[PDB]
């Protein structure tokens, strides 16, 4: 009987979740930012002592976008003048502050408009990229050494990624990898020479007279891809007398015969490196293990240290092949692999033996390998209570695979079912982050005897606040189709009367290996819709979804816009059968792949849905990028899968839209899913006389994430929903 969670609450952020992010700097010490000062805490006991006062950079005379303290705490890097590029990427200005000297380093600075900077992982070495060339600083205040002379805008990329590698392979702008003690610096070089440009307008500030045409090399399904080459430089033997020597490590022969990608870079020991390559047909990948050769100065990659990974029913890995975690000697390694039942479990490999041995089994999956000591492997999975939507930390005894113990399931069972972990430098201590179903809880533990020394943050203040608002409840459950469990979640309005009939809004993503039904606690506009508009908001994970094995995940192989669409419809039906849903009032909405699925549903003719909103939807797979799209579809040639490409487009369903209300929204500057896709949607709809609502957002990207634009889009969608449900 209090006040509700309102749209203004959501947009103005009035009820905020506290976090606690630390950074381990040793085996028993981490850094936190309490009251804008950086403090160093000592886990072994309790003490805490100031590492850097907030006042230190009162004198900088620059808005400070980001900082990064070197591994040895001697130097701090200061990032200012951030100017955005894509997603994960930018340009900035950098200053280095000597913590001993308590002085800014003014001689030999890092050039303006730098693309990326990393410290070496142990000293205070620096690698940065500027105009697409790599530069190394050994001592922070002496001339950088230029590693590459070959970089060229939009063509050659040394040490940073091009659009497609950034978005779809590495999930980062960086393409540098230091060896553990910073001796070697491994890097990739991308070549976009023959890759087609996507072009689009940028309007900018009202005063720019002629719009800017932005050009990005971007391969669409089937188009010419970038090429990759791999190098390693020895940073200890750099010199100003002599251009650095980068040794090129060449891909395996099974890759050289055709288009390929470099999909993983992992260091095994101070002198051993592992590279994973993937064929453009993502059926087939090879791991190469290369040793450094103290005499010749090169890198030896023995065949029969190679390890082939094939998929007979889809692609390798969940999104890419998984990364290996080597033992300390680097002669054996652990790696998540899909087993005979098609469930992803931990595999134990010898670098010279083709076969591997599974150390876990079961109808549940390993999410990630988190830490590896000599005695124990620490990993996260969804085994607990057979819920694919939960996460917990487990540790498995390396001498007895039967001795696996669960470090988080009993910590706080009714409140915490979604854990992620951050380990100290030798897995001595670890922090546990709990994400739901209750409010997020952050604790600290020592792994010696698993004791929970400290509660870092519990969101008491937030809990207090939420007592005095009518919050919605969340149900998480499953239904059974064809002898298989498919989970869903529902956000249910306050005072939920099982007898009344509520309007329903399907929240959809449904992309391959996705998962919208989980145990995470959230404060978002579904909260607003449930709390204030008495509207049930639902998500469902049908065919081709994650973390339940390959029977479900690979179900949509070679055929997007089929099974997952069907299943989202089926879930609206199944929700009707439950009897508290007013079936004259089911909307559906989704962004990106979810916009694609929303559109496909609205055009299905099913007659189940009254209206939908599609934000930045894919409309036709030949429009999306090669890496992502071909992973699930192969090439759009008629020798391959062209039929399923063409059968599966939004525009070909245009007629059916005559039965539904449709809102179509897209940012004009979306470099990911191009405005093109929606331009094509609205064009087909016009061409068959269908009415619909639309909205462009000038200059927004795929995120539509800028403040004003974000409150605007949610307000607009709110009005469309409230109107479509004929609610006040
Ligand atoms: C990045 O990719 C481009 C595209 O391949 C590379 O440029 C191309 O390099 C090839 C050789 O690898 C050149 O072919 C040669 O051309 C000459 C005459 O042009 C011919 O007589 C030779 O026998 C050979 O056929 C080609 O010209 C060139 N193409 C373009 C578009 O410039 C480029 O070198 C790559 N950069 C890298 C990997 O660093
Ligand atoms: C390292 O390599 C570069 C690139 O080839 C050399 O730079 C060129 O040097 C030539 C010959 O002096 C000049 O004609 C060019 O103007 C230079 N290009 C650039 C971009 O500088 C450079 O001399 C080499 N340095 C060392 C130590 O050998
Ligand atoms: C980082 O590892 C490197 C390479 O393994 C270590 O350097 C080697 O050490 C041995 C014995 O000291 C030498 O004989 C090799 O020639 C070195 N390899 C090089 C420099 O290429 C080095 O000790 C490690 N770095 C630190 C800080 O300990
Ligand atoms: C900076 O640090 C001091 C001392 O701990 C603290 O009292 C002060 O509020 C801080 N300033 C800001 C604005 O965060
Ligand atoms: C914490 O206290 C211990 C024992 O009194 C001391 O040796 C150590 O220096 C302290 N650690 C820090 C980071 O101050
Ligand atoms: C960066 O650009 C500014 C503004 O033009 C200039 O004052 C400064 O010299 C530059 N800094 C560096 C490190 O070159
Ligand atoms: C994918 O690889 C398989 C073997 O793993 C190959 O036989 C097939 O033709 C490839 N592409 C598909 C699934 O058409
Ligand atoms: C169950 O069986 C039918 C017929 O084989 C199939 O078309 C349907 O998609 C299946 N349902 C699911 C969700 O697998």
């Amino acid at each position: 009987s209090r006040k509700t969670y309102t749209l203004t609450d959501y947009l103005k952020n009035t009820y905020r979740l506290k976090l606690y992010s630390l950074r381990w700097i040793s085996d028993h010490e981490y850094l936190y930012k309490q009251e804008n000062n950086i403090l160093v805490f000592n886990a072994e006991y309790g003490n805490s002592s100031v590492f850097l006062e907030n006042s230190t950079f009162d004198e900088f005379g620059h808005s400070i976008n980001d900082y990064s303290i070197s591994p040895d705490g001697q130097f701090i890097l200061l990032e200012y003048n951030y100017v955005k590029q894509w997603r994960h990427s930018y340009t900035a200005s950098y200053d280095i502050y000597d913590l001993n000297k308590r002085q800014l380093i003014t001689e030999e600075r890092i050039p303006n408009n730098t693309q990326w900077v990393t410290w070496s992982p142990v000293g205070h070495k620096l690698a940065y990229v500027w105009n697409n060339d790599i530069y190394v600083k050994i001592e922070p205040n002496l001339p950088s050494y230029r590693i590459t002379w070959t970089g060229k805008e939009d063509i050659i990329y040394n040490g940073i990624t091009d659009w497609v590698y950034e978005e779809e392979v590495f999930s980062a702008y960086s393409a540098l990898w230091w060896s553990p003690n910073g001796t070697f610096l491994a890097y990739a070089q991308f070549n976009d020479t023959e890759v087609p440009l996507i072009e689009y307008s940028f309007y900018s500030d009202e005063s720019l007279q002629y719009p800017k045409t932005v050009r990005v090399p971007y391969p669409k399904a089937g188009a010419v891809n970038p090429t990759v080459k791999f190098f390693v430089v020895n940073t200890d033997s750099l010199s100003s007398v002599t251009n650095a020597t980068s040794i090129q490590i060449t891909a395996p022969a099974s890759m050289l015969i055709g288009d390929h990608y470099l999909c993983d870079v992992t260091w095994a020991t101070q002198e051993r490196i592992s590279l994973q390559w993937l064929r453009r047909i993502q059926n087939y990948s090879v791991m190469d293990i290369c040793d450094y050769d103290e005499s010749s100065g090169r890198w030896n990659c023995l065949v029969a240290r190679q390890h082939i990974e094939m998929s007979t029913t889809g692609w390798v890995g969940r999104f890419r092949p998984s990364e290996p975690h080597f033992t300390l000697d680097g002669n054996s390694f652990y790696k998540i692999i899909s087993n005979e039942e098609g469930y992803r479990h931990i595999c134990y490999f010898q670098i010279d033996k083709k076969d591997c041995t599974f150390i876990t089994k079961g109808t549940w999956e390993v999410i990630g390998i988190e830490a590896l000591t000599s005695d124990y492997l620490y990993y996260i999975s969804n085994e607990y209570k057979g819920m694919p939507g939960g996460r917990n930390l487990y540790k498995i005894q390396l001498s007895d695979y039967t001795k696996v113990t669960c470090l988080s399931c009993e910590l706080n069972p009714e409140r915490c079912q979604y854990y992620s972990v951050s380990f100290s430098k030798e897995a001595k201590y670890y922090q546990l982050r709990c994400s739901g179903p209750g409010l997020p809880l952050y604790t600290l533990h020592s792994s010696v005897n698993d004791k929970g020394l400290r509660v870092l943050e519990d969101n008491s203040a937030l809990d207090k606040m939420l007592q005095n608002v009518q919050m919605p409840s969340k149900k998480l459950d499953f239904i059974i189709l064809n002898e298989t469990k498919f989970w869903y979640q529902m956000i249910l309005p306050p005072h939920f009367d099982k007898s009344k009939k509520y309007p329903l809004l399907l929240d959809v993503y449904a992309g391959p290996c996705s998962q919208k039904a989980d145990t995470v606690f959230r404060l978002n506009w579904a909260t607003y819709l449930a709390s204030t508009e008495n509207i049930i908001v639902a998500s469902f994970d049908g065919r081709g979804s994650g973390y339940q094995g390959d029977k479900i995940m690979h179900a949509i192989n070679r055929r997007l816009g089929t099974f997952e669409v069907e299943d989202q419809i089926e879930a609206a039906r199944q929700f009707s059968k439950m009897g508290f849903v007013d079936n004259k009032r089911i909307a559906i909405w989704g962004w990106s792949y979810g916009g694609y699925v929303t559109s496909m549903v609205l055009g299905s003719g099913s007659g189940v849905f009254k209206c939908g909103i599609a934000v930045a939807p894919v409309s036709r797979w030949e429009y999306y990028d090669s890496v992502y799209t071909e992973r699930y579809m192969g090439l759009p040639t008629p020798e391959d899968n062209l039929d399923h490409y063409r059968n599966s487009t939004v525009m070909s369903r245009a007629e059916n839209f005559k039965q539904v209300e449709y809102l179509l929204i897209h940012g004009t500057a979306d470099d990911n899913v191009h405005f093109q896709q929606s331009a094509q949607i609205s064009k087909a709809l016009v061409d068959v006389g269908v009415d619909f609502q639309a909205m462009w957002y000038t200059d927004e990207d795929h995120g539509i994430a800028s403040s004003t634009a974000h409150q605007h889009i949610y307000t607009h969608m709110s009005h469309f929903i409230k109107q479509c449900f004929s609610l006040p």
Side-chain angles (χ1 to χ4, degrees):
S1 186
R2 309 116 287 187
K3 61 193 172 301
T4 38
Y5 190 82
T6 64
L7 176 78
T8 308
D9 283 336
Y10 176 56
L11 306 162
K12 240 63 212 181
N13 229 257
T14 60
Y15 303 112
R16 33 171 69 86
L17 278 64
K18 293 176 91 203
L19 308 186
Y20 196 106
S21 42
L22 54 272
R23 188 211 151 201
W24 300 97
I25 66 171
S26 90
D27 66 284
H28 70 285
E29 298 187 317
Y30 68 74
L31 306 185
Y32 190 58
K33 207 163 97 83
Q34 177 172 27
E35 213 174 4
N36 212 269
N37 310 64
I38 297 163
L39 288 143
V40 48
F41 299 78
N42 191 295
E44 186 178 343
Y45 304 96
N47 49 345
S48 179
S49 38
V50 184
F51 180 86
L52 205 71
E53 286 171 341
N54 42 15
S55 53
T56 303
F57 305 103
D58 287 349
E59 295 297 76
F60 200 47
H62 283 141
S63 176
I64 285 183
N65 305 126
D66 203 6
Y67 70 85
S68 171
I69 299 162
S70 71
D72 56 26
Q74 283 189 50
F75 294 93
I76 155 166
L77 176 62
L78 296 178
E79 177 167 343
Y80 63 107
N81 289 343
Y82 174 126
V83 169
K84 206 175 174 192
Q85 172 86 6
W86 293 319
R87 161 182 285 106
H88 301 110
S89 58
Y90 37 75
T91 245
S93 277
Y94 294 78
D95 269 350
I96 308 178
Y97 188 84
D98 188 327
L99 287 180
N100 326 272
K101 293 173 56 75
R102 289 197 193 175
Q103 200 162 24
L104 226 68
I105 289 180
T106 58
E107 50 244 296
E108 299 281 356
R109 318 155 82 109
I110 300 184
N112 285 314
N113 304 291
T114 290
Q115 293 155 288
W116 188 258
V117 190
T118 329
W119 294 106
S120 59
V122 297
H124 44 256
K125 287 176 182 171
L126 245 14
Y128 67 91
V129 175
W130 178 78
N131 291 332
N132 302 23
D133 282 319
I134 301 164
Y135 290 84
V136 180
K137 271 201 179 313
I138 281 174
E139 221 66 17
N141 72 334
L142 306 178
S144 308
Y145 304 83
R146 184 158 189 193
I147 308 303
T148 57
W149 278 265
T150 217
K152 177 175 209 220
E153 196 180 85
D154 290 334
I155 304 307
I156 302 297
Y157 299 74
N158 296 114
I160 48 166
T161 38
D162 73 355
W163 191 92
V164 83
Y165 268 91
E166 173 175 356
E167 230 57 35
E168 303 285 10
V169 172
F170 291 116
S171 311
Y173 195 28
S174 141
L176 296 186
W177 302 267
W178 289 105
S179 70
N181 60 12
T183 288
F184 299 101
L185 182 55
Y187 69 89
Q189 170 184 277
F190 308 97
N191 198 349
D192 284 5
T193 290
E194 308 289 10
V195 167
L197 269 15
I198 173 82
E199 313 197 356
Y200 62 82
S201 313
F202 202 91
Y203 306 96
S204 172
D205 182 76
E206 153 176 4
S207 76
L208 180 67
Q209 186 174 50
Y210 284 87
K212 183 184 165 208
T213 299
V214 172
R215 288 174 236 265
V216 178
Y218 180 115
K220 299 184 185 265
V224 154
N225 260 352
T227 44
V228 61
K229 288 167 188 186
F230 191 79
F231 299 92
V232 191
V233 67
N234 177 331
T235 73
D236 276 326
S237 54
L238 295 175
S239 161
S240 55
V241 165
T242 283
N243 287 338
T245 290
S246 299
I247 276 65
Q248 193 247 14
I249 292 183
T250 132
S254 56
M255 293 299 149
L256 291 187
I257 67 147
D259 279 8
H260 58 271
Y261 319 100
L262 165 68
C263 61
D264 187 82
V265 178
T266 301
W267 282 92
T269 77
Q270 299 299 352
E271 301 186 16
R272 214 196 297 276
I273 210 199
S274 66
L275 294 182
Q276 288 189 78
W277 308 81
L278 175 67
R279 282 192 157 135
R280 204 227 246 219
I281 304 302
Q282 308 171 43
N283 248 312
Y284 186 99
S285 73
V286 183
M287 177 187 305
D288 215 15
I289 306 207
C290 314
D291 287 90
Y292 175 72
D293 184 316
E294 235 128 0
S295 74
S296 70
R298 333 195 96 250
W299 289 87
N300 241 257
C301 300
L302 319 164
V303 191
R305 258 168 193 187
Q306 294 182 21
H307 288 83
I308 303 161
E309 199 159 308
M310 298 189 69
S311 179
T312 75
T313 66
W315 59 102
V316 181
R318 287 185 177 106
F319 295 86
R320 29 178 197 155
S322 68
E323 87 297 333
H325 302 244
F326 284 82
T327 56
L328 182 51
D329 61 3
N331 304 119
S332 67
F333 67 87
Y334 298 88
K335 189 185 200 280
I336 295 179
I337 288 304
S338 181
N339 69 30
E340 269 62 81
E341 291 67 17
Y343 286 84
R344 301 182 129 76
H345 286 272
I346 304 183
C347 226
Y348 175 56
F349 283 84
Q350 295 305 313
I351 73 181
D352 26 48
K353 297 296 187 61
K354 138 173 192 141
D355 283 343
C356 87
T357 126
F358 280 106
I359 78 165
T360 76
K361 48 234 261 309
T363 62
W364 49 269
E365 282 191 334
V366 177
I367 303 315
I369 293 177
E370 301 293 328
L372 170 68
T373 75
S374 64
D375 302 82
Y376 288 100
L377 183 148
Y378 294 79
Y379 73 94
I380 297 246
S381 88
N382 52 8
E383 190 190 319
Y384 190 68
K385 282 181 126 70
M387 299 165 58
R391 300 289 143 105
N392 280 290
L393 181 61
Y394 290 84
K395 82 156 153 90
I396 183 193
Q397 175 166 332
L398 291 175
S399 55
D400 194 352
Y401 301 160
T402 81
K403 247 78 207 312
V404 21
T405 123
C406 187
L407 312 173
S408 61
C409 322
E410 301 198 344
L411 281 200
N412 227 278
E414 286 325 268
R415 170 184 189 169
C416 291
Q417 296 161 54
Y418 212 89
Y419 285 96
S420 71
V421 65
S422 168
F423 280 94
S424 76
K425 203 122 298 194
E426 290 192 309
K428 248 288 188 180
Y429 302 92
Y430 57 93
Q431 177 207 26
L432 240 24
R433 314 173 180 263
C434 178
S435 309
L439 313 168
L441 185 52
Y442 300 78
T443 51
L444 190 69
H445 312 279
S446 64
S447 43
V448 177
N449 40 23
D450 297 313
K451 288 316 127 95
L453 3 154
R454 206 135 298 108
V455 161
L456 300 176
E457 165 67 55
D458 56 346
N459 289 285
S460 332
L462 180 51
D463 186 40
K464 220 66 61 59
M465 270 141 79
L466 304 191
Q467 297 183 26
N468 202 37
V469 354
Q470 306 192 44
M471 298 283 292
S473 36
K474 172 168 176 192
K475 172 187 191 180
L476 157 60
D477 215 323
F478 61 101
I479 80 210
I480 309 181
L481 316 163
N482 294 353
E483 321 116 44
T484 24
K485 310 187 206 319
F486 290 97
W487 269 259
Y488 60 94
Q489 50 171 59
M490 300 195 190
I491 306 293
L492 298 180
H495 300 310
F496 175 72
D497 183 349
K498 186 237 303 286
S499 131
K500 314 209 233 96
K501 283 184 184 290
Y502 291 80
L504 177 59
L505 168 62
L506 209 45
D507 200 291
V508 66
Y509 182 84
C513 201
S514 63
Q515 190 185 76
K516 297 280 288 192
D518 59 13
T519 67
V520 181
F521 169 90
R522 297 191 178 84
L523 289 184
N524 56 24
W525 108 297
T527 311
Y528 151 73
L529 296 177
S531 170
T532 298
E533 311 296 353
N534 297 102
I535 177 269
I536 299 174
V537 172
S539 309
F540 171 76
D541 288 319
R543 268 167 299 174
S545 39
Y547 314 115
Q548 305 161 89
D550 295 10
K551 214 283 185 57
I552 291 184
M553 196 182 66
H554 286 183
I556 66 179
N557 185 236
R558 306 189 109 250
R559 54 185 294 174
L560 304 169
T562 60
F563 294 138
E564 77 282 23
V565 194
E566 289 177 28
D567 292 350
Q568 220 70 12
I569 302 168
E570 191 52 43
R573 291 195 190 95
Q574 219 77 17
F575 292 160
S576 276
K577 286 189 185 175
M578 300 187 76
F580 49 93
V581 172
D582 168 15
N583 58 66
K584 300 294 185 178
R585 265 149 96 225
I586 338 288
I588 179 184
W589 97 276
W591 159 93
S592 212
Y593 199 107
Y596 169 68
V597 182
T598 298
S599 288
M600 289 292 264
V601 167
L602 290 172
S604 70
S606 91
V608 179
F609 299 80
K610 182 182 199 298
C611 50
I613 312 175
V615 190
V618 156
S619 70
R620 179 167 136 100
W621 293 109
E622 287 115 300
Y623 295 160
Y624 205 50
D625 75 66
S626 52
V627 178
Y628 185 95
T629 287
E630 281 150 36
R631 174 152 65 236
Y632 314 115
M633 299 285 287
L635 299 331
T637 78
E639 293 90 293
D640 201 335
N641 199 39
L642 176 52
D643 276 348
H644 285 145
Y645 266 83
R646 293 192 312 177
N647 212 257
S648 62
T649 68
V650 170
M651 21 253 17
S652 56
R653 309 182 170 206
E655 284 287 344
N656 291 317
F657 280 80
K658 202 54 174 175
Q659 315 171 36
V660 295
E661 292 152 25
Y662 186 51
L663 170 60
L664 176 66
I665 315 174
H666 213 125
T668 65
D670 190 320
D671 56 312
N672 207 315
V673 177
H674 303 147
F675 185 82
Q676 172 193 36
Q677 312 231 21
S678 292
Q680 294 293 10
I681 301 179
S682 62
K683 186 154 61 72
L685 287 180
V686 166
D687 291 336
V688 298
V690 177
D691 204 20
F692 59 102
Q693 300 300 329
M695 180 68 49
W696 71 80
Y697 278 97
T698 305
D699 281 352
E700 290 297 304
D701 54 16
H702 199 33
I704 314 189
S706 69
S707 178
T708 47
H710 172 253
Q711 11 201 1
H712 194 284
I713 187 173
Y714 280 95
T715 295
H716 206 267
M717 284 192 287
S718 298
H719 293 327
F720 180 86
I721 288 287
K722 277 217 271 66
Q723 183 284 315
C724 160
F725 282 163
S726 48
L727 294 169

